[PDB]
Design a protein around this ligand. Structure first.
Ligand code: HEM
Ligand SMILES: O=P([O-])(O)O
Ligand SMILES: [Ca+2]
Ligand SMILES: [Ca+2]
Length: 306
């Protein structure tokens, strides 16, 4: 029962406030649009899009920010605080942090050249955070294709089109050397590189991520257009130039009979990818929301109201 018109009477300019915050932030941090999209993904995969990920530690629950998928990885929380403060100034006690993050994710994709659409709204904010659930639910870059599929199925995204389209989020943003070292030097305990990685690209990545190098050094997910939201992600996969294992699995796994045609169709038509990305984003945004009088309108996104 989420609806795109939820704030049309109570805070009609919310989307513009969000967009203006991201644009101002992009002036100093060109990565923030990618980081915000990822925060929304990590919100939704853990008890639904309920802003659980934004809560700080308390003595009764641990923050999801300490999860393996978030710690020293997720970023942009201060930007969310800034846009929440601005929306609170304009429409007090009205817009949930969960909806704010959803809007910010959509605006981030559009600002980077991606599709533009009106997200469903009406989510409410959780009363707790779910660290253990984050550690169980968030997929990992060394997952095989059946494990990736199971990770999406576990949160309610059954369709291979969900997985292939949402993986297109890696058409922009950055990845730490840590998560590709195995592919470059010791894949599956062979002491050898991943044979599905293009051998010329292998040499490039070894130059960026040497053995004994800084594991926190960042590499672009999309070697073609690292900052533009477009379908080049899938073109890379067809050339064996997916960056992390879970990217290339979509095209090269023995289990990819159903994902290969999707990768090819998205590589062949930007419109096909953009349509599928919006559809999959709206489904992800629909994972187990609190609505109505459930949850609250959190006033400070880091803490429950008191
Ligand atoms: C399918 C399983 C997925 C896996 C295994 C995965 C894994 C990763 C990893 C390892 C990173 C780098 C994090 C770091 O270096 O600290 C990353 C970044 C990113 N992920 Fe994914 N991810 C997945 C799905 C998604 C989805 C569904 C989205 C959004 C629709 C997404 C959007 C992003 C973005 C935008 C970044 C870059 C963030 C930044 O530069 O701050 N990913 N992901
Ligand atoms: O796939 P649905 O029916 O949970 O939207
Ligand atoms: Ca959540
Ligand atoms: Ca791109």
């Amino acid at each position: 029962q989420l609806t795109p018109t939820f704030y049309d009477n109570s805070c009609p300019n919310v989307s513009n406030i969000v967009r203006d915050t991201i644009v101002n932030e992009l002036r100093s941090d060109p990565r923030i649009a990618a980081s915000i999209l990822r925060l929304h993904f990590h919100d939704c995969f853990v008890n639904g899009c309920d802003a659980s990920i934004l809560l700080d530690n308390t003595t009764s629950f641990r923050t999801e920010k300490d999860a393996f998928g978030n710690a020293n990885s997720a970023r942009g929380f201060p930007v969310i605080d800034r846009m929440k403060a601005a929306v609170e100034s304009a429409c007090p006690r009205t817009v949930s942090c969960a909806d704010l993050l959803t809007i910010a994710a959509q605006q981030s994709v559009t600002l980077a050249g991606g599709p533009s659409w009106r997200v469903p709204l009406g989510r409410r904010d959780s009363l707790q955070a779910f660290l253990d659930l984050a550690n169980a639910n968030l997929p990992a870059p060394f997952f095989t294709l059946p494990q990736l599929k199971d990770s999406f199925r576990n949160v309610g995204l059954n369709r291979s089109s969900d997985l292939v389209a949402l993986s297109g989020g890696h058409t922009f943003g950055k990845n730490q050397c840590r998560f590709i070292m195995d592919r470059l030097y010791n894949f599956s305990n062979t002491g050898l590189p991943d044979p599905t990685l293009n051998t010329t690209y292998l040499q490039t990545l070894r130059g960026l991520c040497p053995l004994n190098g800084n594991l926190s050094a960042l590499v672009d997910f999309d070697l073609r257009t690292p900052t533009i939201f477009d379908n080049k992600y899938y073109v890379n996969l067809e050339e064996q130039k997916g960056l992390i294992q879970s990217d290339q699995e979509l095209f090269s796994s023995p289990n990819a009979t159903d994902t290969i045609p999707l990768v090819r169709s998205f590589a062949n038509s930007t419109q096909t990818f953009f349509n599928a990305f919006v559809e999959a984003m709206d489904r992800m945004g629909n994972i187990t929301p609190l609505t109505g009088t459930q949850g609250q309108i959190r006033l400070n996104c880091r803490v429950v109201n008191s």
